[PDB]
């Protein structure tokens, strides 16, 4: 809403390990093929949709921003996991 | 008015189902009950499969159970009897005293599936609560209405220190703690009750300061994942109508979280990650939001956790820490050769040890023993290899210091009265941090070390070094 | 000289064994979270696989 | 533009993981038993249907510089296993060779070609 | 043999887990959920009526010698592992000692016998 009214949005996303967690649920309770980690193929797609709703607009939308500022916890301290 | 009635179609293991009539169906979650020559069986309704049919967890052994057989809905869940007389009386998942004592007295009757506080509802500051042990309440304090984590293991003094907490919790506000046995071991238990008839904190002819609810491990799964939830319901409402700083123990928090998992897989549900239900965490949440501090009064949970495969990065464990705060690594031998406690300050960690909330002194004092500890622990190598002379003047003071400190972690039990001799004395976290302190300043150095052994405040380390003197010459 | 050469390589060998107690400790701490890690995606493994054997 | 133009094409792309992983998306409502690790089992099938029809092709010729994501840095995923078979000339980019600082981060013991004849 | 002769005879099976095998080969397409790691949920009752139909009787005596072979050479396989309940005198073989040049490769101290005692 902010951005496209011409202003500028901080939006942070805490914890989305635990919204990956609750879409596992969500799928594994809907009788969904289990993935990597029993995660469903479509984690990859619900961080995508979600993040790439936040860009700065161009002079002509009226140049408003959306800034996304996601919290993941990663476990053992590394970063080469599915979902990181 | 007209019971609601059926019929049992199927018992498959645990998993008993039921077909109703029309516009008779309950919701789910809630009690069920058949008669059966040697009890009740009582079944909790999870899944509605249409036809008028639900599918329904047996609480209880369902054996010799045939199809066509009545049953009988409660209206509601699970409910437990509440109220003050169920301290001192040994309680099941059903509410059924199974300490054969007579029936419960209780006038209230609540069910186990209740909502967590809502927002506004829920305190806004963190809040302190003493715990008595002096080395607890300094380096590793106790959360009022926290979710402390009891890291300990076998032949530590584990059970010693839930009696003390209950003992000083009892003393120090209002305490009436509830003690939750889920996979009760029905001999460590019934070790457990004869130990609360002989400290005193169960009254069979006065009052007791605790309740002891838990489920044997014998029992079917689910009761186990349900003996937590009569608990807590025992806790809140000794919360939310009596404005007590209440405190719950849980048998083993793994155990719950293995129960959830056991329980899901025979409903069908796919487990997630190891074997392990795809509502770990919503299972957790839905325990550990209740157990919390609120407007009128505050429950701090103390939980026994175990580590499979001593693997931290096991999903259960996440999950549980998840709702930690605080917790205390119970020293395996390690501080238990000499310190009572044998707590491991020095793996034993609290997030409230902050100035905001112990305030500026009680994080500086810690952090001092802390660091004090460090250094002689990484001294003590070369300590073991030549001794005391390789170290320099400032390293032999600083050993010698924290051995004192070390010495004077140590604290006496008012449970532990009838064990040895010694009086336990309820330190307070004042007098806790001014006595850490002073022996930080450095002013008692000439006390010997085992003037701090076996003692509470600091004043009974200059009584108890005027008593050696006394004794020396 | 023999001597001040003998006591300068054992405080040398010293100070190499503490390096390697050092190195080992690190790699010890990556190997322990690789093995964790593994045993963990291997159960998913046989779960997931007898899961879709339903 | 290789037909019907007659000139040197030069296709890019920026991932083909995607497309495995978009068939995977779509296998699982589909109605097709789940494949290794929760693949779609048309896997090999569709990815070389989609990597053949890029070929040199005699009436003209084309480069294309493929893409490709290894899940969790993971080089035996099913997919980059199968598209490991539909390729010539390859660049790893291992991570180690990343946190080493050497920028490209292609591991030299794993880039590999045909062309490498005397 | 054995019963109606009175005879001693000698049973050469070799790589009895192909008899496990091939059960577990069926056991999918005759609509049985699969056990762990992918056998047969009934590998042990069947196994064990074949073995103990493998014994020395009152009437007769037979020597059973029979060749396992553990697939991936792992002893912790069900297959394998529920067929050492059932053998006396157990030789196994070991790949390290055959690489390093000892042919009869039998390992000197996992391979073990209920006869070895004074």
Do not use: C
Not at chain 1, 44 to 61: G, T
Not at chain 2, 8 to 28: N, R
Not at chain 2, 326 to 354: F, H, M, Q
Not at chain 2, 366 to 385: F, G, H, N, R
């Amino acid at each position: 809403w902010f951005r496209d009214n011409g202003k500028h949005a901080l939006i942070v996303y805490d914890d989305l390990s635990k919204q990956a967690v609750a879409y596992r649920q969500l799928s594994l309770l809907l009788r969904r093929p289990p993935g990597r980690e029993a995660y469903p193929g479509d984690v990859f797609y619900l961080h995508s949709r979600l993040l790439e709703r936040a860009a700065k607009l161009s002079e002509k939308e009226g140049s408003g921003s959306l800034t996304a500022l996601p919290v993941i916890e990663t476990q053992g301290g590394d970063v080469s996991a599915y979902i990181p | 008015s007209t019971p609601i009635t059926g019929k049992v179609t199927a018992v498959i293991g645990a998993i008993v189902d039921v077909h109703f009539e029309q516009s008779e169906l309950p919701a789910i979650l809630n009690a069920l009950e058949i008669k059966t020559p040697q009890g009740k069986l009582v079944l909790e309704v999870a899944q509605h499969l249409g036809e008028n049919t639900v599918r329904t967890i047996a609480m209880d052994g369902t054996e010799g159970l045939v199809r066509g057989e009545k049953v009988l809905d409660t209206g509601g869940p699970i409910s437990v009897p509440v109220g003050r007389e169920t301290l001192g009386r040994i309680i099941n998942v059903i509410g059924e005293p199974i300490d054969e004592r007579g029936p419960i007295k209780s006038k209230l009757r609540k069910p186990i599936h209740a909502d967590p506080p809502s927002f506004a509802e829920q305190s806004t500051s963190a809040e302190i609560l003493e715990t008595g042990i002096k080395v607890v309440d300094l380096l590793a304090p106790y959360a009022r209405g926290g979710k402390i984590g009891l890291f300990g293991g076998a032949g530590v003094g584990k059970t010693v220190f839930i009696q003390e907490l209950i003992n000083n919790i009892a003393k120090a506000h209002g305490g009436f703690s509830v003690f939750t046995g889920v996979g009760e071991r029905t001999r460590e238990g019934n070790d457990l009750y004869r130990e609360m008839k002989e400290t005193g904190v169960i009254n069979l002819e006065g009052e007791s300061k605790v309740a002891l609810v838990f489920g044997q491990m014998n029992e079917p799964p689910g009761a186990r994942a349900r003996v937590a939830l009569t608990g807590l319901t025992i806790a809140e409402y000794f919360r939310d109508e009596e404005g007590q700083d209440v405190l719950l123990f849980i048998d083993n928090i793994f155990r719950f979280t293995q129960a959830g998992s056991e329980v899901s897989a025979l409903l069908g549900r796919i487990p997630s990650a190891v074997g392990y239900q795809p509502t770990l965490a919503t299972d957790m949440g839905l325990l550990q939001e209740r157990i919390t501090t609120t407007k009128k009064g505050s429950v701090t949970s103390v939980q026994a956790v175990y580590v499979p495969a001593d693997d931290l990065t096991d999903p259960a464990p996440a999950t549980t820490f998840a709702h930690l705060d605080a917790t205390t690594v119970l020293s395996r031998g390690i501080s238990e050769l000499g310190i009572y406690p044998a707590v491991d300050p020095l793996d034993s960690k609290s997030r409230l040890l902050d100035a905001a909330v112990v305030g500026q002194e009680h994080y500086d004092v810690a952090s001092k023993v802390q660091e004090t500890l460090q250094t002689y622990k990484s001294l003590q190598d070369i300590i073991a290899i030549l001794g005391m002379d390789e170290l320099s003047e400032q390293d032999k003071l600083t050993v010698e210091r924290a051995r004192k400190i070390q010495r004077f972690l140590s604290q006496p039990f008012a449970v532990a009265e009838v064990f040895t001799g010694i009086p336990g004395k309820l330190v307070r976290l004042k007098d806790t941090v001014a006595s850490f302190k002073a022996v930080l300043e450095g002013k008692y150095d000439n006390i010997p070390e085992h003037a701090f052994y076996m003692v509470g405040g600091i004043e009974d380390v200059v009584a108890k070094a005027e008593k050696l003197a006394a004794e020396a010459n | 000289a023999m001597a001040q050469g003998y006591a300068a390589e054992i405080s040398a060998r010293r100070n190499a064994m503490d390096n390697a107690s050092k190195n080992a400790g690190d790699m010890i701490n990556r190997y322990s979270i690789l093995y964790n890690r593994t045993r963990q995606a291997v159960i998913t493994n046989e779960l997931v696989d007898i899961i879709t054997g339903a």
